[PDB]
Amino acid sequence: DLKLPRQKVELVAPPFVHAHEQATKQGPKIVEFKLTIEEKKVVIDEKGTTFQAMTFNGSMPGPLMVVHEGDYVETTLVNPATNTMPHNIDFHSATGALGGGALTLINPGEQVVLRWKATKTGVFVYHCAPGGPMIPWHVVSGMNGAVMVLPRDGLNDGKGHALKYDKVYYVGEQDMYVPRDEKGNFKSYDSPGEAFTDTEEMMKKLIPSHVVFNGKVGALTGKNALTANVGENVLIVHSQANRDSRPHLIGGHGDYVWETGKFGNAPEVGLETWFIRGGSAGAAMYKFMQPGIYAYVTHNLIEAADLGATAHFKVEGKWNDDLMTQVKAPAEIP
Amino acid sequence: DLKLPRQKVELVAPPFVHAHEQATKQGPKIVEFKLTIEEKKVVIDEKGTTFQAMTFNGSMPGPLMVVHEGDYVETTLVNPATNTMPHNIDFHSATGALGGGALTLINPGEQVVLRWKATKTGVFVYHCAPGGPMIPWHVVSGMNGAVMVLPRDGLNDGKGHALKYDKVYYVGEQDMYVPRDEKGNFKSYDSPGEAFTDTEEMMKKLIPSHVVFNGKVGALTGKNALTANVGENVLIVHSQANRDSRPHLIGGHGDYVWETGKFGNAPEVGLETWFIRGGSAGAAMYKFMQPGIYAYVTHNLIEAADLGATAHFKVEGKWNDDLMTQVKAPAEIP
Amino acid sequence: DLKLPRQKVELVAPPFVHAHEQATKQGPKIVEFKLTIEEKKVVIDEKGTTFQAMTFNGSMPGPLMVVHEGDYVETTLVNPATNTMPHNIDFHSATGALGGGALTLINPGEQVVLRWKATKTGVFVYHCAPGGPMIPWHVVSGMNGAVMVLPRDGLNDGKGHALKYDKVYYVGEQDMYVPRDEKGNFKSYDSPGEAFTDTEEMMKKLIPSHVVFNGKVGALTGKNALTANVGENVLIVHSQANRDSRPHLIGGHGDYVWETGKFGNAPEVGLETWFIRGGSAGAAMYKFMQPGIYAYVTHNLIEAADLGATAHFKVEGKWNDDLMTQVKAPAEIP
Ligand SMILES: OC[C@H]1O[C@](O)(CO)[C@@H](O)[C@@H]1O
Ligand SMILES: OC[C@H]1O[C@](O)(CO)[C@@H](O)[C@@H]1O
Ligand SMILES: OC[C@H]1O[C@](O)(CO)[C@@H](O)[C@@H]1O
Ligand SMILES: [Cu+2]
Ligand SMILES: [Cu+2]
Ligand SMILES: [Cu+2]
Ligand SMILES: [Cu+2]
Ligand SMILES: [Cu+2]
Ligand SMILES: [Cu+2]
Secondary structure, eight states: OOOOOEEEOOOOOTTSOOOOOSBOOOOOOEEEEEEEEEEEEEEOSTTOOEEEEEEETTBSSOOEEEEETTOEEEEEEEEOTTOOSOBOOEETTSOSGGGGGGGOOBOTTEEEEEEEEOOSOEEEEEEOOOSTTHHHHHHHTTOEEEEEEEOTBOEEOSSSOEEOOSEEEEEEEEEEOOOBOTTSOBOOOSSHHHHHHHHHHHHTTTOOSEEEETTSTTTTSGGGOEEEETTOEEEEEEEESSSOBOEEEETOOEEEEETTOOTTSOOEEEESBOOBOTTEEEEEEEEOOSOEEEEEEESOHHIIIIISOEEEEEEESOOOTTTEEEEEEEEEOO | OOOOOEEEOOOOOTTSOOOOOSBOOOOOOEEEEEEEEEEEEEEOSTTOOEEEEEEETTBSSOOEEEEETTOEEEEEEEEOTTOOSOBOOEETTSOSGGGGGGGOOBOTTEEEEEEEEOOSOEEEEEEOOOSTTHHHHHHHTTOEEEEEEEOTBOEEOSSSOEEOOSEEEEEEEEEEOOOBOTTSOBOOOSSHHHHHHHHHHHHTTTOOSEEEETTSTTTTSGGGOEEEETTOEEEEEEEESSSOBOEEEETOOEEEEETTOOTTSOOEEEESBOOBOTTEEEEEEEEOOSOEEEEEEESOHHIIIIISOEEEEEEESOOOTTTEEEEEEEEEOO | OOOOOEEEOOOOOTTSOOOOOSBOOOOOOEEEEEEEEEEEEEEOSTTOOEEEEEEETTBSSOOOEEEETTOEEEEEEEEOTTOOSOBOOEETTSOSGGGGGGGOOBOTTEEEEEEEEOOSOEEEEEEOOOSTTHHHHHHHTTOEEEEEEEOTBOEEOSSSOEEOOSEEEEEEEEEEOOOBOTTSOBOOOSSHHHHHHHHHHHHTTTOOSEEEETTSTTTTSGGGOEEEETTOEEEEEEEESSSOBOEEEETOOEEEEETTOOTTSOOEEEESBOOBOTTEEEEEEEEOOSOEEEEEEESOHHIIIIISOEEEEEEESOOOTTTEEEEEEEEEOO
16 A cells, blocks of 8 residues: 555666766655666677677666665566566665565566665666576676666765766666687587586686677777766776676776765775775765766776776867976977 | 683584673683584585585685684684695684784604784684795685684673673685586596696686585575574574675575674664675674574675575574565465 | 976886885875886796796886875876787776776887876876787786775774884785696796787686796795785785786784785774775785794795795794694694
8 A cells, every 4th residue: 555656767778878867856656667677699809700699678788777765666667578588676775575576587478577765875786686696697788777766865975075976877788798719719609508517517717708898899989988977976886796896997096985875874085996896886976177088997907908898988178288288299309 | 921811713614603601701712623624525506516525624624713802812723634725724803823824834754833912803714824825825726714803701792781692603615627628528637736826727717606604505504504593593603714704694684784893983873784894804793583484695696596506595584474474475466 | 387396216126116105295296107017037936937027127026106186196107118018007096998908009219208196096007008908918928007095194004093004015926827848847038929829828727827926936935025014004015917816925914014015994893804906006014913923825825835935934033822822732632
């Protein structure tokens, strides 16, 4: 007999986030979301390597869901008959039934509706978890995303001062395990089922072949670079459902960082690199001070440069010579 | 000339913890413990894989020792003549002589008695460390446990409020390195000595074959599941003497977490996943809100599901539909 | 038109640090440093294994630079014509142009001068980053160091009390990737260029062959052990530019630790083991209470004992029997 107002949310593909309020005068609502599972073969790198992906809403990561503390989140999970496997969903933000996993197992052709109360603030992972050895396999195949539960008064610095972001991006990092053949080339498979045996063997050795943001090498570069202007406060939500990450904004800092991702704790200030524990999401805010290109990386630099984990920001505005200047350009040594 | 009262403790096998007070009106005491080293071949998985273990008190991990700040901990370490190797003990809680290691080296047939003052609060690792390449080998063979040094006033939230647990469990995570033969089956050995060469070769490649709680795959499941009731505040002490872990209670949270394990620091609140640095112990408290099965895992899900690192909690009590409800059971898609 | 006083610093090889003030009554200055790149073949272990190193100032790590908040750091980077490759420098302490990387790319025979304002306090990594796959390779070849930006009032405990160190050491940890030949021996190369192909192949598998402090196995042991006396407060700055580390002082503690390395945040107290995220520097202070040998290690004990990551401290002073005592020396079991 829960008779609160209902509000539908139109989810958007990462790294964008659906429109929301930070601080709100709204009371609790039932916020309604729909996720549709899609299994699909995708290209994950510039050499054309393929991968048997399984996704929420067709994307890796799944879309960011945003609600406020005390809202009730009502999710319709749909597993169309064009898929081959059972799936479910586990929200780390939710309390009971294995985060909802025990109440959302659906075969192809079925859908289910789960409601949970958002009692804990922060950014949290959600992922598929359909039992036993299937749990890691579905997660590293792409079935993970995040939810952000905001305080009703918005974010604060722990010292009584509001922290308002001008925009938010969601960067989902995915460790992928693509086996190679005898000659050393990556293998392609006709189905997730067929990829399973070789993939599981590789997974158990714990070293990924690729580590990517937003599903592919170079996904957040070029035309699809993240953007900002000098003076803008940007929130970057970062998730990793299986393996640790160490985010770093090259040329900037984390001005305010919740590395464990939970807004009941004050943020740390002035970080160079932060740490996202496997199975969690964290958040970092930075006010841009300089224009130009920034790279956002995990600062295992082999992963960043060689396995796929680099995004770009293109920042517009005026160069600040007080902060940094080339005193003398490259010249022959005297 | 230390003339304080003496108190004997009867240690109990993990994941249980010997009876103790949280807040106490006792002053400092000499608390007396005995550890007896046992080298033994054990079965570590459901397929019957064997492992040359070396243990304190016959268990992996070694038992949790519990004392209060300012107590003196007096340990009798015994290395029976049925063992083959020298051993010692290093307490991370202790100050000087390599944590006691430099004062406790004993050959088979010998015992030693060490006393140290508990000047630092928290949960701390203890482990064998008998010099050079032997140090990692003895530790990953099972020779590690933990000690908890409580404040005399018990635990607090950093905001002046007492945090009292209704029960405590100790989960010791062990990375194990079992070599395989040419055909790909795990190897068995007649002695720790014989296992050394092949084991060291594998250890240096840094990828474990198994990652287990309480010594074996499935140790804390079934009849030996951890238990609680809705409304109970449970403290989970987690240690890892060699390699990082990322504990996560599936379907719950860390309400209060000391991830670095030290009670001089306020706990963080409302975590989804926490991080236990290799060579440390941490502690997390959670008040159960829902009945049913929970899994406690490291949230590298490949390790949890495929290499052995999953425990269960079975929780009794009344389901709370406000927190979570199946709005519509699995049904055919319209 | 920046007309502040100028101050030259004579850099010193790690683990020592150039003379500096903690708290200062000086106002902002332009502090001038020079770094000269050297590519060179070095011996990294006791068996005589060689490695194609690339360094700032001839050392791994590069020297620690120390300044105060609000100073301007003016660095002359020199790439002599005896080197074979372009190089640059990226300061994590600096704001804009990829930390200076985009303004400091120099071919052999060139030098450049960069100035940046030290707006953020803490210890920060600096490293070479000359684009694409070259970035990880130059960093794991040795091209990394750290800078420490002190508050003008010196360090504090977060509770209003000054924390003054009697000495500081800089420990730079380096993950190295040396390939092996068919028979299993480490390979030697005539040039960095020639080492590249085999080295990159190994790097992408993410497991180092060696993990060393100050450039070599056993660098900070023997004649070159770190030293202290009972009663001395020592600051240990630890950096790792590519891979996580878990520092631990065997027989001691971290009394005050900034594991994320940033002095805008209060230190944690009473740690056993702390965590240095890959791409960062952290700092820990400890007041020695006992004489004798301590080991400082990463507490992945396989790395510490088998791959090279152990330093020693030799501490002079009076043994404290209250803190720790051998009650009964090794004796036959009754
Ligand atoms: O930012 C969150 C933090 O801010 C405060 O409300 C005020 O200090 C704390 O109680 C909380 O942990
Ligand atoms: O919970 C431990 C914390 O609680 C306090 O005593 C009170 O804020 C702090 O000084 C300490 O760090
Ligand atoms: O030590 C640094 C910390 O000390 C304080 O200035 C006083 O509590 C804090 O504002 C800061 O985070
Ligand atoms: Cu699934
Ligand atoms: Cu999970
Ligand atoms: Cu031993
Ligand atoms: Cu140890
Ligand atoms: Cu370089
Ligand atoms: Cu960097």
